[PDB]
């Protein structure tokens, strides 16, 4: 499957793509404002994620640090990134269907649209000013708005027991972005697409 990753933000981002235990395609790349990066994701990929990283510095070897979404200091991510990260999530070719969603379960750093470029389903978007409106206790110094599990590490926020409800913090994310997951047991906003669809992820779509 083909994913076109487009940076419409006025600032540079370092896109990342991983399935948790391996990179997808090159795993990461700098995107200046307006740039597009096309990656190929193997059919059958389960649990892939794409995210943006902000305020990164990398040396020649591709090692460094980012203020949001850092994946162990690497430009080419092999593992998932440190919150806060708005997440585009996907599982492809699962019994004939693709499943896509946007998630704020690991916080929010950059607004995002995640849409198919082929026919048969709708896209999803979280483009509100979550960082500007972020509750004081969730604000991350490097930038972004953390989720409550990252900040407080309780069974309720992290849904450790498999039973948890919405919270004051999850409801904040849900009010600004209804079509994104706001906590682990949120009513799913996953979109079902035909298997082998292609997609575009746009940072700062508005």
UniProtKB/Swiss-Prot annotation:
Stored InterPro entries: Osmotin/thaumatin-like_sf, Thaumatin, Thaumatin_CS
Name of one Pfam family that matches: Thaumatin
Record keywords: Cytoplasmic vesicle, Disulfide bond, Signal, Taste-modifying protein
GO cellular component: cytoplasmic vesicle
Localization annotation: Cytoplasmic vesicle
Paired cysteines (S-S): 9-204, 56-66, 71-77, 121-193, 126-177, 134-145, 149-158, 159-164
Location, primary (coarse class): cytoplasm
Family: Belongs to the thaumatin family.
Role of this protein: Taste-modifying protein; intensely sweet-tasting. It is 100000 times sweeter than sucrose on a molar basis.
Name of the featured protein: Thaumatin I
Source species taxonomy: Eukaryota, Viridiplantae, Streptophyta, Embryophyta, Tracheophyta
